[PDB]
Nucleic acid binder design. Structure first.
Length: 49
DNA sequence: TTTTTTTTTTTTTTTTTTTTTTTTTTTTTTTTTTTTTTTTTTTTTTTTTTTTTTTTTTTTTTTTTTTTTTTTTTTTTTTTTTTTTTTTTTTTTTTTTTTTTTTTTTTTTTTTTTTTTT
């Protein structure tokens, strides 16, 4: 269907795409949700919603 | 009755070609090795009320160096042409359906003879 989905591409080999509803609201001041996106000595570049 | 001409398949063995046994190179295939996903629990991390002293924005004014500015001549932009690649009509070939025409092979069992090896 059309459902809001996240996508991100990193340096090297990443085109991972999780669903948007897994992450919940937070108050600005805490952050650090620690998403689970394994990366071996590369750098993230892009996120899209 | 003797004697003379010609014709071919064999003594043929050698040249040419064909057939049949061979083994280098790019395309398969089984193994080990490294990327993925789901649970336990676990100290550990992390979400949310209360108080607090803070440190940056908004009253007001100042200037100067980036915002005004006009103009010459470049040079990226656009035009035409042609080549290279992509992609889709067109054609060809092959396979399956069900009644017809044709064929071809592998082994037991015993007993006797050829046909090679020692």
């Amino acid at each position: 269907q059309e459902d809001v989905v996240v996508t991100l591409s990193h340096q090297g080999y990443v085109k991972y795409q999780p669903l948007s509803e897994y992450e919940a609201q937070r108050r600005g001041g805490k952050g650090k949700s620690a998403a689970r996106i394994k990366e071996e000595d590369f750098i993230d570049r892009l996120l899209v919603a």
